[PDB]
Ligand SMILES: [Mg+2]
């Protein structure tokens with residue numbers, strides 16, 4: 001699958017979400033260049049206003065675009081599953097608040113890498129940092145720890161994201177994730193390692209719909 005990633009690849013993201021009963025959808029488009037661990041995308045809420053803050057959705061919205069150094073290429077599960085793809089499931093625990101459960105399918109459609117997601121959020125507090133919209137339009141992430149899951153011919157991944165609250169405080173989002181191949185073909189099952197990421201959220205000055213522009217860089221390491 002690595003060969004599929006040598007140049008710039010278009011990406012499409014489609015998400016249907018329901019958080020405490022608030023339903024919404026988001027469409028995103030952009031491109032990824034795995035040689036540089038780089039992605040650029042613009043997301044738009046197609047049903048109106050997003051009911052949760054945009055930064056809470058970044059991680060849900062394509063780790064196959066991570067740059068794996070030559071010496072670690074044999075640990076790159078993500079690209080090895082393509083084009084058939086993989087299912088990525090998560091539970092994201094917002095400290096002292098609700099949780100998101102997501103299921104996505106990541107695969108190629110033609111020359112485009114597609115990430116289709118279903119998200120369900122429950123137990124959020126009506127006036128917590130999420131539904132109350134008290135988060136700043138940014139975040140800080142920890143290392144993304146990856147390990148093999150032989151039993152499922154996949155990987156297990158865990159990490160934390162620290163959301164910044166408007167009052168100067170922090171809201172932790174603990175991520176638990178599993179990825180399993182869609183195809184029956186061989187995949188790379190890796191030794192333990194981690195991804196290091198950074199991103200920048202911005203707005204399209206000329207855009208009136210609720211949206212987010214994202215620039216993100218990710219590199220594998222720890223080997
Ligand atoms: Mg802070």
Ligand SMILES: [Mg+2]
Pocket residue numbers: 191
């Ligand atoms: Mg080994």
